[PDB]
Write an enzyme that holds these catalytic residues in place. Structure first.
Site, PDB file in Angstrom:
ATOM      1  CE1 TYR A 194      36.997  12.513  14.475  1.00 21.43           C
ATOM      2  CE2 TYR A 194      36.164  10.909  13.193  1.00 21.43           C
ATOM      3  CZ  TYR A 194      36.056  11.872  14.223  1.00 21.43           C
ATOM      4  OH  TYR A 194      35.329  11.032  15.228  1.00 21.43           O
TER       5      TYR A 194
ATOM      6  CG  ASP B 107      34.758   7.711  14.348  1.00 19.44           C
ATOM      7  OD1 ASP B 107      34.422   8.585  14.535  1.00 19.44           O
ATOM      8  OD2 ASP B 107      33.731   7.410  14.143  1.00 19.44           O
ATOM      9  CB  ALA B 108      37.986   7.546  20.410  1.00 22.03           C
TER      10      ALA B 108
ATOM     11  CB  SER C  76      32.359   1.157  19.657  1.00 22.63           C
ATOM     12  OG  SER C  76      32.055   1.701  17.899  1.00 22.63           O
TER      13      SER C  76
ATOM     14  CE1 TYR D 284      35.879   4.370  21.868  1.00 19.20           C
ATOM     15  CE2 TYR D 284      34.397   6.042  21.974  1.00 19.20           C
ATOM     16  CZ  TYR D 284      34.343   4.507  21.793  1.00 19.20           C
ATOM     17  OH  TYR D 284      33.392   4.272  21.060  1.00 19.20           O
TER      18      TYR D 284
ATOM     19  CG  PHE E 111      32.966  17.875  21.403  1.00 20.25           C
ATOM     20  CD1 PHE E 111      34.679  17.210  20.892  1.00 20.25           C
ATOM     21  CD2 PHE E 111      32.165  18.860  21.080  1.00 20.25           C
ATOM     22  CE1 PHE E 111      34.906  18.790  20.438  1.00 20.25           C
ATOM     23  CE2 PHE E 111      32.640  20.200  20.066  1.00 20.25           C
ATOM     24  CZ  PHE E 111      34.287  19.062  19.236  1.00 20.25           C
TER      25      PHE E 111
ATOM     26  CD  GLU F 161      29.098   5.344   8.010  1.00 22.11           C
ATOM     27  OE1 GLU F 161      29.212   6.223   9.407  1.00 22.11           O
ATOM     28  OE2 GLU F 161      27.986   4.727   8.449  1.00 22.11           O
TER      29      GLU F 161
HETATM   30  O1  LIG Z   1      29.872  10.890  23.986  1.00 21.56           O
HETATM   31  C1  LIG Z   1      30.722  10.580  22.468  1.00 21.56           C
HETATM   32  C2  LIG Z   1      30.483   9.696  21.786  1.00 21.56           C
HETATM   33  C3  LIG Z   1      30.932  10.033  20.592  1.00 21.56           C
HETATM   34  N1  LIG Z   1      31.757  10.819  20.405  1.00 21.56           N
HETATM   35  C4  LIG Z   1      32.709  10.932  19.288  1.00 21.56           C
HETATM   36  O2  LIG Z   1      32.084  10.501  18.176  1.00 21.56           O
HETATM   37  C5  LIG Z   1      32.307   9.699  17.074  1.00 21.56           C
HETATM   38  C6  LIG Z   1      31.950   8.724  16.974  1.00 21.56           C
HETATM   39  O3  LIG Z   1      31.606   7.377  18.684  1.00 21.56           O
HETATM   40  P1  LIG Z   1      30.085   6.364  18.139  1.00 21.56           P
HETATM   41  O4  LIG Z   1      31.425   5.319  17.390  1.00 21.56           O
HETATM   42  O5  LIG Z   1      29.469   6.018  18.933  1.00 21.56           O
HETATM   43  O6  LIG Z   1      29.346   6.454  17.107  1.00 21.56           O
HETATM   44  P2  LIG Z   1      29.484   5.627  15.947  1.00 21.56           P
HETATM   45  O7  LIG Z   1      30.219   5.439  14.870  1.00 21.56           O
HETATM   46  O8  LIG Z   1      28.432   4.614  15.993  1.00 21.56           O
HETATM   47  O9  LIG Z   1      28.293   7.422  14.885  1.00 21.56           O
HETATM   48  C7  LIG Z   1      33.764   8.775  18.554  1.00 21.56           C
HETATM   49  O10 LIG Z   1      34.947   8.220  18.006  1.00 21.56           O
HETATM   50  C8  LIG Z   1      34.143  10.407  19.369  1.00 21.56           C
HETATM   51  O11 LIG Z   1      35.073  10.965  18.759  1.00 21.56           O
HETATM   52  C9  LIG Z   1      32.003  12.430  21.553  1.00 21.56           C
HETATM   53  O12 LIG Z   1      32.841  13.202  21.140  1.00 21.56           O
HETATM   54  N2  LIG Z   1      31.381  11.926  22.879  1.00 21.56           N
END
Ligand SMILES: O=c1ccn([C@@H]2O[C@H](COP(=O)(O)OP(=O)(O)O)[C@@H](O)[C@H]2O)c(=O)[nH]1
Length: 304
Positions: A198, A200-201, A301, A49, A27, A232
């Site tokens: 699903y 995470d990217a 990440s 990503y 998003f 998570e």
């Molecule tokens: O601007 C953004 C940032 C994150 N994501 C989504 O949110 C997920 C989680 O990202 P992040 O690793 O920053 O979050 P955390 O894992 O630390 O909660 C990513 O894989 C994306 O699918 C997104 O859609 N837009």
């Protein structure tokens, strides 16, 4: 296949066949950061990503790869996403606005009034008067400004992960059906009522996933930082649409005045479904529900 144990209740391991689609989500809040004719998915050295998504498509060549996107994309950026669909056959770009989530929605005024009556149906000794006052103040704000504000419309206005997590759970409730609702062609092995995985990217696939076996067809990521572990939503795998664990999570958000998509929609739904109460071992539940696959390098990440 076999079975999995949590305390004294036993659960069959249900399969997620090799055609269960994968789901990535991006998003974009600031699409103008990208080139006007550039794929509007972050692809830096720091956060590659887009490369991780393509690389998953190259490994899982015969498996459908969904990419749920959202944002004020320019016309040239939407054609770049269409070109991506061309270069990689299994990649299916789904615009979040092209899906109908109204069947999971609820009016905020209904949630607040239900909670006001419930809190007020208690004597002064157990009344959470601070919560009572905040809910009436939230209800007052809705009736004054947006009397038809709903869970979807309210979350649609939020900035941050709270909005990603909200639509993520609703898509997974649709499961494979979301690809058919969005009109994605040539998915071949997608079944109506089928599951979804699903990721995470930043979760990179290094080999093929094959067929998974999860307790009652659901498993989620368990993150370990320092000496702690936690449920998570960076990985959510379901073998069927409208999974009762995610449905119960949405039910909690239909009954809670300020339900959170991650803590209630995911963690609350799983613990309620599998009966991980106050009396149970949270660590035991994590090991039982954890999504394990050696061909996934999780969470890169956090520095990798
Ligand atoms: O601007 C953004 C940032 C994150 N994501 C989504 O949110 C997920 C989680 O990202 P992040 O690793 O920053 O979050 P955390 O894992 O630390 O909660 C990513 O894989 C994306 O699918 C997104 O859609 N837009």
């Amino acid at each position: 296949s076999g079975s999995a144990n949590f305390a004294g209740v036993e659960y069959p391991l249900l399969p997620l066949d090799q055609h269960t689609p994968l789901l990535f989500q991006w998003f974009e809040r600031n699409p103008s950061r990208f080139g006007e004719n550039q794929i509007p998915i972050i692809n830096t050295q720091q956060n590659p990503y887009l490369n991780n998504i393509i690389n998953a498509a190259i490994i899982e060549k015969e498996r459908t790869i969904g990419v749920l996107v959202d944002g004020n994309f320019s016309a040239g950026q939407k054609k770049a996403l269409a070109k991506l669909e061309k270069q990689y056959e299994n990649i299916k770009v789904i615009y979040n606005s092209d899906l109908d989530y109204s069947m999971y929605d609820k009016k905020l005024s209904d949630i607040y009034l239900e909670n006001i009556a419930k809190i007020e149906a208690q004597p002064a000794n157990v009344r959470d008067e601070y919560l009572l006052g905040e809910i009436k103040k939230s209800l007052n704000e809705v009736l004054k400004n947006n009397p038809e504000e709903s869970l979807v419309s309210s979350h649609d206005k939020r900035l941050g992960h709270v909005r990603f997590d909200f639509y993520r759970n609703l898509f997974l409730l649709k499961g494979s059906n979301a690809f058919l609702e969005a009109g994605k062609h040539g998915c071949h092995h997608l079944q109506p009522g089928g599951g979804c995985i699903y990721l995470d990217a930043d979760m990179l696939l290094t080999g093929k996933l094959g067929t998974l076996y999860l307790p009652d067809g659901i498993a989620v990521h368990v993150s370990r930082k320092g000496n702690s572990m936690s449920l998570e939503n960076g990985i959510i795998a379901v073998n069927r649409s409208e999974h009762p664990a995610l449905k119960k999570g949405l039910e909690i958000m239909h009954s809670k005045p300020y339900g959170d998509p991650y803590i209630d929609g995911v963690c609350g739904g799983l613990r309620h479904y599998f009966n991980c109460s106050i009396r149970h071992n949270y660590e035991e539940f994590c090991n039982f529900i954890e999504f394990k696959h050696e061909h996934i390098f999780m969470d890169t990440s956090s520095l990798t």
